[PDB]
Design a protein around this nucleic acid. Sequence first.
DNA 1: CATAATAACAATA
DNA 2: TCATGATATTGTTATTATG
DNA 3: CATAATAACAATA
DNA 4: TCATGATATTGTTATTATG
Lengths: 319, 319
Amino acid sequence: YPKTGVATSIVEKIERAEFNTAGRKPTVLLRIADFIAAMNGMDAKQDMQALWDAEIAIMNGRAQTTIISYITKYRNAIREAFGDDHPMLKIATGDAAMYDEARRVKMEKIANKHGALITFENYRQVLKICEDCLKSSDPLMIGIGLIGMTGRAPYEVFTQAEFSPAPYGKGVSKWSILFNGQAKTKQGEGTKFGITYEIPVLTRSETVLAAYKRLRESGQGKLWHGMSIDDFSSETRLLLRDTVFNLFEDVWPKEELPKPYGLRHLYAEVAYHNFAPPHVTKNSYFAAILGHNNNDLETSLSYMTYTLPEDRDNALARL
Amino acid sequence: YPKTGVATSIVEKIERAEFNTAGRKPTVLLRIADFIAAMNGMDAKQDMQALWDAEIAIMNGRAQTTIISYITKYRNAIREAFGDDHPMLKIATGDAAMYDEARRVKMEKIANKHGALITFENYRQVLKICEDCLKSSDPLMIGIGLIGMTGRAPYEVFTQAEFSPAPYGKGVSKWSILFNGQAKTKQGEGTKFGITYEIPVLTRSETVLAAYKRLRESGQGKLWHGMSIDDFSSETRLLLRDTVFNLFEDVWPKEELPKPYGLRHLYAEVAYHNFAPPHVTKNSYFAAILGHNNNDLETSLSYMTYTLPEDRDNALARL
DNA sequence: CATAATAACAATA
DNA sequence: TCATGATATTGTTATTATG
DNA sequence: CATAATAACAATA
DNA sequence: TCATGATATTGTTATTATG
Ligand SMILES: [Cl-]
Ligand SMILES: [Cl-]
Ligand code: NA
Ligand code: NA
């Protein structure tokens, strides 16, 4: 328990923002910096409570998810400046009802999607487009194609993925590769953090591996590699978004706009349709190929979004 | 907040047990009765804590699930004698780690089953046997057949089920009926408590309805109707168990012994295989036909236990 | 000289 | 299963009384 | 006289 | 997503500087 410290990343972001040619003012980051600064020398939890109450009063008007995210930012700043043992971490948090309601809403959305799956009629054209993106010389395109083919998250694909040949007996597997660099694990001991596991691919493994080699050895590929989530977001998010919008504009199901992470969802589906052994559930297979926490099947629920046109067809054959 | 009261059901069970021709002594019920008796006049929470600590010390040696169940019994007794506002309800409970570990174990079991589904090779013979049980004159048999065909829980089937014709446009549906009397709802406002909803049946609806009419109008049927869970358990559980063991001894998959609730599991599976529309997930369909809480998909995980031989076959066709 | 009856004991949803 | 701090079911076995 | 750049704002897993 | 009290990602839009 120290009473002194500074949140380096926020301050650096501000000082970096002092040379902005355009864009918003970093007001939130400013408030966080001022918060941490005012925290220095504080010992009375009453004062801490008052401060955090001021901050809470400021965030009034924002959306629930937004407020939650901001709270996450504040807490990470506190951890960065003062450590995990600071008492403010017992004060600077959301009220229980907030997280309860967030959970309720999320589960409601998932439950709604499960009762109204979207028919991905042109999924073959999408997969085709990704496979075409594999051969492009534009690193972004190759990345998108890799999101489509390996089903790895954008951050994983662009910043930290490790793809390698998967041994099939005494040879190399054609329809699967080894992957390392799972994201969002939070370094849980039951997670795939630092674990190399085998995943299926929706095209020949040679093409995937080669394409990833072309991506890594690229200039933008060497710029991307090792990036923090903020760096990657600020650098690529909107461009990737626009490019994805434009690529699949006319083939994506009209119930929704084509977003990058959708390619992950679809992947799972297609993968399950083609490679899943008969002794496993859809939840279990999703959980396996997506690299989820040990013994978890609940996260998989979030990925059941589409239904394949053939499944739709023969589910109408049986009737 | 009163300090006086008696748990009527326990005492009545004891006084009823005073005329036992055979069987164990009601020691647990005795301890609960003595507990409630000693609670009378208690005002100091320290004393309450000491008492419940004595009880906890007694239960040492039992299994975790057992201790949990016993705690449930104690709490229900406290609620019966003193009401929901008694402070002992804040003391007479399990420590958080116990329920955490229970959850962990349960989820681990489910996750294990999801990665090793059992091939129900002879499920057609089982369904056939149930359909045969529908025409029997033995009410128990009819009940079993109804567990197999309607997929309703034993307690529901024998004690409180309300089956009725399901309207299909301007007529009666052949492959579905209306059901009322959902169990285990705990009267949640998002549950099917007191709700009549439509369920699929694995044989013609006429046969089901007729068979249930023959069951209800029976003597044992009129004895069963309206029974508490304890009454039904003590009256029927072991007989139903033995009969179920004997009926499906040679056709049930050899990975497990044939238990009544299995017929529910299987039901779901078969139902999903035959009736599920293409726009819904297996989780959602299970949740729908099993009558689960609103927006819940997690309970359905517990019912994915078997895999049908045809699915096994064509999952090996695709390979 | 042995079996059925009962509730403890236990696991599942 | 409903809620996420537990309860309500379903499943198994030791112990007891009894010509 | 208008567009791109940036971080706020927001939702998903 | 990992844990079940939240965090780490991915997705959207208002605001700002700038010949
Ligand atoms: Cl293909
Ligand atoms: Cl059939
Ligand atoms: Na919301
Ligand atoms: Na256990």
